[PDB]
Amino acid sequence: TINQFYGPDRNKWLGPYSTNTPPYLTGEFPGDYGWDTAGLSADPETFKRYRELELIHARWALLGALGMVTPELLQDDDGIMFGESAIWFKAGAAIFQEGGLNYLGNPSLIHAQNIVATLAVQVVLMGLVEGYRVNGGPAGEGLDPLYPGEAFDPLGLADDPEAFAELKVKEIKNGRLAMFACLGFFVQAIVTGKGPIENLTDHLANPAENNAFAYATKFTPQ
Amino acid sequence: LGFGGVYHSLIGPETLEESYPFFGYVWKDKNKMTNILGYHLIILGCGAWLLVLKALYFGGVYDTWAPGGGDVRIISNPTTNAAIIFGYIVKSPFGGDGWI
Amino acid sequence: PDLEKWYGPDRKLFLPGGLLDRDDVPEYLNGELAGDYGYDPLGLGKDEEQVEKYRANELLHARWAMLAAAGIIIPEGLQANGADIKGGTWFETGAEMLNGGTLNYFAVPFGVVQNPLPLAAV
Amino acid sequence: SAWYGPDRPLFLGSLSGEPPSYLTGEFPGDYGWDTAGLSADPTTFARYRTIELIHARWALLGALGIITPELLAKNGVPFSEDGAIWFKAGAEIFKEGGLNYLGNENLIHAQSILATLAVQVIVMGAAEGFRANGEAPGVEGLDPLYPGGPFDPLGLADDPEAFAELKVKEIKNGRLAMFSCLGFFVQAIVTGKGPIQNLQDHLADPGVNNAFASATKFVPTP
Amino acid sequence: EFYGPDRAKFLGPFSENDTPEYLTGEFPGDYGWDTAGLSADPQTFARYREIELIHARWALLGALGILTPELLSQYAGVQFGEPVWFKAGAQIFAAGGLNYLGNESLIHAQSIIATLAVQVVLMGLAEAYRANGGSEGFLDDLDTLYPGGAFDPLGLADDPDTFAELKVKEIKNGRLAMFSCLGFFVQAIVTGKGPVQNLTDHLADPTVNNAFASATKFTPG
Amino acid sequence: MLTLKIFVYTVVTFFVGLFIFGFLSNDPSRNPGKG
Amino acid sequence: LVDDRMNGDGTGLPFGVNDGILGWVIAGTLGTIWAIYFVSQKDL
Numbered sequence: 001t002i003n004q005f006y007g008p009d010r011n012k013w014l015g016p017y018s019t020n021t022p023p024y025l026t027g028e029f030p031g032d033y034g035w036d037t038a039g040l041s042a043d044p045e046t047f048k049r050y051r052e053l054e055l056i057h058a059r060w061a062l063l064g065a066l067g068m069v070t071p072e073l074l075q076d077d078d079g080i081m082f083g084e085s086a087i088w089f090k091a092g093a094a095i096f097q098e099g100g101l102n103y104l105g106n107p108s109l110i111h112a113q114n115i116v117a118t119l120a121v122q123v124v125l126m127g128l129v130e131g132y133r134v135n136g137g138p139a140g141e142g143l144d145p146l147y148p149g150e151a152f153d154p155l156g157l158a159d160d161p162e163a164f165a166e167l168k169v170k171e172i173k174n175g176r177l178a179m180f181a182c183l184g185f186f187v188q189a190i191v192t193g194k195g196p197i198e199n200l201t202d203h204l205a206n207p208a209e210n211n212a213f214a215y216a217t218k219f220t221p222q
Numbered sequence: 223l224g225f226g227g228v229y230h231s232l233i234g235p236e237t238l239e240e241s242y243p244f245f246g247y248v249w250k251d252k253n254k255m256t257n258i259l260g261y262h263l264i265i266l267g268c269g270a271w272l273l274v275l276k277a278l279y280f281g282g283v284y285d286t287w288a289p290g291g292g293d294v295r296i297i298s299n300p301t302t303n304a305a306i307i308f309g310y311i312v313k314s315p316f317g318g319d320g321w322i
Numbered sequence: 323p324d325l326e327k328w329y330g331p332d333r334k335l336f337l338p339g340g341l342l343d344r345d346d347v348p349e350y351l352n353g354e355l356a357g358d359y360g361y362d363p364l365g366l367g368k369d370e371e372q373v374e375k376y377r378a379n380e381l382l383h384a385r386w387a388m389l390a391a392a393g394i395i396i397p398e399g400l401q402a403n404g405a406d407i408k409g410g411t412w413f414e415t416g417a418e419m420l421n422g423g424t425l426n427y428f429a430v431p432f433g434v435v436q437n438p439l440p441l442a443a444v
Numbered sequence: 445s446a447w448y449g450p451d452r453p454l455f456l457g458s459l460s461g462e463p464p465s466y467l468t469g470e471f472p473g474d475y476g477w478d479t480a481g482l483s484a485d486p487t488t489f490a491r492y493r494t495i496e497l498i499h500a501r502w503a504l505l506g507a508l509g510i511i512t513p514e515l516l517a518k519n520g521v522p523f524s525e526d527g528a529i530w531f532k533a534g535a536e537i538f539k540e541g542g543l544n545y546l547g548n549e550n551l552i553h554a555q556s557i558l559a560t561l562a563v564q565v566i567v568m569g570a571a572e573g574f575r576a577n578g579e580a581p582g583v584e585g586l587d588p589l590y591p592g593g594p595f596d597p598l599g600l601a602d603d604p605e606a607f608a609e610l611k612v613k614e615i616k617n618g619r620l621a622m623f624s625c626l627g628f629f630v631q632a633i634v635t636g637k638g639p640i641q642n643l644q645d646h647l648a649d650p651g652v653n654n655a656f657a658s659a660t661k662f663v664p665t666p
Numbered sequence: 667e668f669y670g671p672d673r674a675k676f677l678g679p680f681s682e683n684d685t686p687e688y689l690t691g692e693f694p695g696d697y698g699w700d701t702a703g704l705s706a707d708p709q710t711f712a713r714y715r716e717i718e719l720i721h722a723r724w725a726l727l728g729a730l731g732i733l734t735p736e737l738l739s740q741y742a743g744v745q746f747g748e749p750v751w752f753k754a755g756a757q758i759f760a761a762g763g764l765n766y767l768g769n770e771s772l773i774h775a776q777s778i779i780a781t782l783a784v785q786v787v788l789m790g791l792a793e794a795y796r797a798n799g800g801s802e803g804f805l806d807d808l809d810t811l812y813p814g815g816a817f818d819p820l821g822l823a824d825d826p827d828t829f830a831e832l833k834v835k836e837i838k839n840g841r842l843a844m845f846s847c848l849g850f851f852v853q854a855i856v857t858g859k860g861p862v863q864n865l866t867d868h869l870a871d872p873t874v875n876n877a878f879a880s881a882t883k884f885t886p887g
Numbered sequence: 888m889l890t891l892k893i894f895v896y897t898v899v900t901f902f903v904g905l906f907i908f909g910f911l912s913n914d915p916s917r918n919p920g921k922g
Numbered sequence: 923l924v925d926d927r928m929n930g931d932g933t934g935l936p937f938g939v940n941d942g943i944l945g946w947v948i949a950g951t952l953g954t955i956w957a958i959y960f961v962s963q964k965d966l
């Protein structure tokens with residue numbers, strides 16, 4: 001039910017072991033499990049700002065974490081589709097080879113060679129849409145800065161309040177899941193330099209000696 | 223062009239800003255003078271880029287310095303660097319270099 | 323916003339004010355339908371009710387031709403650029419499936435799907 | 445240009461929306477760039493304002509101290525190649541010639557970094573401690589963020605509106621210089637060359653000699 | 667001394683004039699150096715003061731645990747698998763195992779996954795009990811920051827004046843141990859040697875072996 | 888011998904700078920007329 | 923060679939500059955006049 005996550009006896013960051021809940025986090029907004037051991041959300045309006053950039057961070061981390069492995073998923077046995085650029089942390093070098101930036105292995109898709117020009121178009125367009133996000137325009141102006149839902153919600157869905165509560169905590173949990181997974185993505189890029197799916201296959205081959213303990217010697221300052 | 227010119231001299235509007243604010247101007251409307259300069263300068267940039275299109279993509283213009291006595295040459299790798307272009311525009315106008 | 327530039331008694335015409343007087347437009351165009359430019363030189367407009375009757379034909383015609391223009395420019399561009407469209411050029415696309423031929427769908431970004439549908443059932 | 449009041453310029457132009465209620469435009473450098481709201485409490489606002497200004501002054505000083513020596517090195521002043529590029533200047537004290545200011549043997553010529561840092565600690569600790577009190581020997585008690593007096597012998601802080609627009613000029617130039625300084629630390633980490641040398645190589649061919657030419661240097665290997 | 671407006675501060679005379687209005691020296695270790703202003707609210711005072719105390723204790727144990735094996739290997743004639751504090755993680759990957767006093771009778775562990783599992787479950791239970799401040803009546807009371815009972819068998823939780831004096835002693839020792847452990851951390855990176863060996867090498871030639879002799883080890887080229 | 892060049896270049900830029908900022912410096916208002 | 927000559931005649935020297943000190947003093951003189959004019963601008 002709703003009170004399982006928005007009641008005063010809601011789900012917490014320790015279950016029934018969160019006795020010293022912060023007073024200001026009463027379970028009104030999505031999440032609100034009380035994990036504020038650093039106490040950086042003491043001020044109310046600042047807590048609002050941190051929550052808004054939390055949901056923005058969460059959504060763009062959802063895009064990132066999902067899009068990490070899709071080219072590596074579509075990677076074939078030898079790689080006519082993509083060469084060394086199938087890996088996530090080698091994707092940018094898809095602009096500097098002799099052919100161009102092909103989306104799915106063919107010249108018919110994208111096929112760009114001016115990284116500076118696509119940089120300029122990206123910057124102008126999405127800086128403009130950030131200005132629309134913070135002020136308003138064609139979609140809406142006086143709506144909720146975090147939760148507008150007017151032109152971006154065409155499939156119904158967003159009409160019921162307990163549905164709002166449920167699938168908003170579904171948002172915050174899925175976003176935090178992608179957020180944590182993305183940290184995994186960057187740090188496995190650092191400590192190993194190997195792709196996620198191929199690391200997963202190497203671990204499922206033999207979990208015993210293949211672990212991060214096998215790379216604990218790599219950062220040793222000899 | 224001549225038909226349009228005689229039309230605007232004879233039956234064209236006698237004063238422009240009462241019907242076309244985009245085309246009318248008092249000579250102290252400095253913002254709209256700057257707008258007119260912007261339009262004309264965009265036209266001149268378009269003409270220069272048209273010469274670019276001819277020199278690099280339409281296979282024209284004669285180079286006198288091709289071996290054997292010159293050739294009409296489609297220009298590949300033009301030198302656009304600021305050092306040479308500006309040094310070409312800020313040098314002496316005498317026989318030592320020649321300014322322009 | 324800014325409906326006066328296209329609607330109302332004073333609107334954009336097919337000729338400007340110096341060459342076209344505002345009285346040379348026939349009476350049944352007074353600035354209430356979209357695209358009202360006062361360009362009816364022959365006797366096809368006749369009256370506003372017949373204008374409304376041809377409006378449905380004109381709008382569906384415009385939308386159909388808009389779909390036709392997009393579906394002409396896209397598959398031939400894909401064929402010329404390298405996509406396996408197998409008949410992207412628009413006025414030979416029917417000649418592909420006569421004896422045992424087929425078609426291919428390039429539905430971006432995950433296209434390249436071989437269609438086994440025969441022409442009679444299609 | 446009405447740098448104060450409600451009609452002040454903002455941090456996104458017309459698309460900025462509503463500036464925060466706790467920032468109404470009393471202080472220089474005001475544009476409403478408060479996405480995370482670090483400055484909710486006025487005491488915290490004051491501490492961050494002092495930190496920003498001290499960093500602005502230090503960034504301006506570092507900007508000239510990072511541009512001038514390599515300019516003189518390429519303009520006939522006999523700097524060593526070691527000390528011409530700023531991040532290696534501290535290594536010049538380890539050489540037999542010592543630290544030669546402007547390439548002069550009988551100028552500075554320091555060889556004891558231990559004593560140099562010791563006198564540096566003493567002098568700057570005294571200076572910053574006198575800054576912290578607001579009272580110094582011979583200096584009365586006044587504004588700690590804007591002392592003037594002995595620090596303004598020219599007397600340009602006497603007139604109010606010119607003093608305010610000069611405050612705006614100072615904070616904006618400081619922000620520009622701190623962009624520059626963070627950029628110089630970025631080229632120092634990435635390029636390993638001086639910033640003026642980076643601009644010089646960028647002017648040879650701006651198509652390829654830009655930031656995109658170094659995107660594949662820090663990529664990890666398995 | 668260390669309490670009230672005549673307490674010691676973070677700059678001595680240089681801090682006599684300007685201090686935050688919200689730092690009165692009530693809490694131990696208060697010298698009033700919050701010049702960044704990251705702590706304006708009492709709620710974050712409570713939470714982040716608890717953060718400071720737990721970091722103080724944990725850095726003290728880290729400092730006592732880093733120098734002990736190297737100070738037992740040198741000047742004491744005791745052998746181990748690997749005496750270096752930041753190289754003691756890799757010593758488990760040899761055939762020897764996890765050795766306590768140079769002898770295979772003690773511990774002799776070779777299952778890092780199992781011992782990490784028991785560490786994480788024990789630590790999770792203990793830390794949840796810490797954050798709970800007790801549960802179901804069992805220690806479900808007390809200070810949650812200064813426990814005393816069930817953790818002070820020596821009976822030094824009484825006489826609050828000298829108790830607070832030793833409390834300030836504790837927070838000062840914790841900050842000094844934070845220095846010591848941070849120094850161990852960065853000396854592991856800029857040099858890659860043991861701190862005891864570093865101290866021993868520095869004593870022979872303090873003019874040559876300093877921080878500046880390794881100041882060019884991270885220059886970019 | 889380049890010292891002569893430096894001196895004359897300095898004085899030429901000085902006179903030219905006087906000209907440039909003199910006519911930049913609100914020159915059309917230096918008139919007795921009502922303008 | 924029998925004499926020391928400037929040897930900069932021609933060669934495409936921008937503004938006739940052959941050594942950096944001359945460009946630096948040109949910029950210095952123009953900046954000096956500019957600073958005088960700017961600080962003494964608005965008549966007063």
Ligand code: CHL
Nearest residue numbers: 107108109110111112113114117118121392395396399403
């Ligand atoms: C430097 C060389 C360069 C070259 C050779 C190409 C070549 C190409 N690029 Mg490009 N590009 C290049 C640089 C760059 N591109 C881009 C960004 C893009 C994008 C974003 C796209 C391309 C695409 C294309 C292709 C367009 C041809 C086509 O499909 O025609 C036939 C098609 C047309 C003539 C028009 C089709 C328009 C399309 C939007 C139709 C949509 C129809 C729907 C009904 C829309 C309905 C929406 C709403 C209203 C309901 C083509 C192979 C397209 C591609 O790969 O498509 C698969 C594409 O989408 N480029 C950038 C960044 C600014 C570049 C920078 O240098």
Ligand code: CHL
Nearest residue numbers: 089090091092093095115119186189656659660662663664
């Ligand atoms: C969040 C955005 C983002 C991230 C994380 C990356 C990451 C990367 N890009 Mg990249 N890019 C990003 C955006 C963009 N890139 C490009 C264009 C290119 C090109 C042209 C190339 C790359 C390449 C690379 C890789 C360089 C190798 C390396 O070790 O780098 C440093 C990365 C690490 C040490 C790993 C850890 C990353 C982690 C610290 C990042 C997360 C925090 C960041 C500070 C981001 C903060 C937000 C803002 C500033 C982006 C790398 C993994 C190169 C490549 O693929 O080479 C094989 C390459 O050639 N990018 C564009 C323009 C379209 C971008 C636009 O947004």
Ligand code: CLA
Nearest residue numbers: 013025031032033034035036040041050051054176179180
């Ligand atoms: C930068 C991302 C980010 C940001 C801005 C926030 C922000 C917020 N979180 Mg959240 N959280 C995140 C990531 C983030 N979180 C992730 C990935 C998880 C999954 C582990 C969680 C799980 C979580 C829970 C369970 C709860 C919150 C809550 C909150 C709110 C109050 C707590 C707070 O203010 O702490 C301050 C946060 C910051 C100052 C910014 C975080 C960035 C830090 C400083 C850098 C990285 C930290 C650390 C090094 C990461 C590495 C460790 C990793 C293995 C986890 C607040 C608006 C509480 C709430 O009330 O819900 C609304 C709540 O109980 N979060």
Ligand code: CLA
Nearest residue numbers: 501504505589590591592595596600601610611613614617
């Ligand atoms: C261009 C940057 C800039 C600007 C616009 C200002 C502007 C101002 N400062 Mg300031 N300052 C700066 C940089 C700047 N400062 C730097 C880098 C430092 C660190 C050394 C300081 C340290 C400082 C202190 C301690 C104080 C001020 C004060 C003031 C205010 C009154 C003084 C005044 O008007 O003199 C005129 C300002 C100018 C004419 C602009 C400066 C341009 C000079 C000529 C360039 C110098 C560069 C040159 C190569 C020398 C190298 C620097 C060297 C001295 C280290 C005023 C609004 C006083 C105040 O707070 O007001 C009450 C005061 O107490 N400043």
Ligand code: CLA
Nearest residue numbers: 676694695696697698699700704705714715717718721844
């Ligand atoms: C992570 C360890 C840690 C923590 C949690 C604290 C926490 C606290 N300190 Mg403390 N401090 C520390 C380390 C720490 N300190 C160290 C190592 C020193 C010696 C330099 C000091 C010296 C000190 C003094 C003199 C005082 C405090 C005070 C305080 C309290 C005031 C709130 C505040 O400081 O705002 C918020 C603080 C932060 C948000 C800190 C963020 C940390 C970032 C990462 C900056 C890192 C800086 C970098 C590592 C510096 C290099 C180390 C260098 C000094 C050698 C607070 C509870 C005041 C007090 O009254 O005591 C009760 C006070 O007077 N501290």
Ligand SMILES: CC1=C[C@H](O)CC(C)(C)[C@H]1/C=C/C(C)=C/C=C/C(C)=C/C=C/C=C(C)/C=C/C=C(C)/C=C/C1=C(C)C[C@H](O)CC1(C)C
Nearest residue numbers: 035036037038060061063064067068088091179180182183
């Ligand atoms: C709350 C709290 C409380 C307590 O007490 C204290 C503390 C500790 C403070 C806390 C916590 C915190 C945290 C956890 C944080 C975290 C964060 C994160 C996660 C980040 C990341 C983050 C991350 C992220 C976003 C990421 C993202 C990603 C992305 C976009 C990607 C993109 C991409 C793609 C698609 C692909 C291609 O090829 C490339 C690119 C283009 C690049």
Ligand SMILES: CC1=C[C@H](O)CC(C)(C)[C@H]1/C=C/C(C)=C/C=C/C(C)=C/C=C/C=C(C)/C=C/C=C(C)/C=C/C1=C(C)C[C@H](O)CC1(C)C
Nearest residue numbers: 477478479480481499502503506509510530533622625626
């Ligand atoms: C506002 C806000 C709000 C929102 O909301 C959020 C956020 C985002 C957080 C924000 C932002 C922030 C930022 C950006 C910051 C930054 C700053 C800086 C950059 C600084 C620097 C700053 C900088 C600086 C000081 C610098 C300095 C420098 C120096 C000293 C140098 C020195 C030197 C020299 C001379 C030379 C030699 O050879 C070397 C040396 C000796 C070394």
Ligand SMILES: CC1=C[C@H](O)CC(C)(C)[C@H]1/C=C/C(C)=C/C=C/C(C)=C/C=C/C=C(C)/C=C/C=C(C)/C=C/C1=C(C)C[C@H](O)CC1(C)C
Nearest residue numbers: 504505507595596597598599620621624627639640642643
């Ligand atoms: C206080 C007082 C009072 C009394 O009474 C009077 C007096 C004496 C006047 C005074 C003093 C003052 C002062 C000290 C001043 C200073 C200033 C400055 C330093 C500025 C800078 C300023 C500076 C600055 C902005 C800087 C900037 C820089 C930059 C942009 C850079 C850029 C870049 C980069 C990124 C990189 C590349 O590779 C190159 C480039 C491209 C080039």
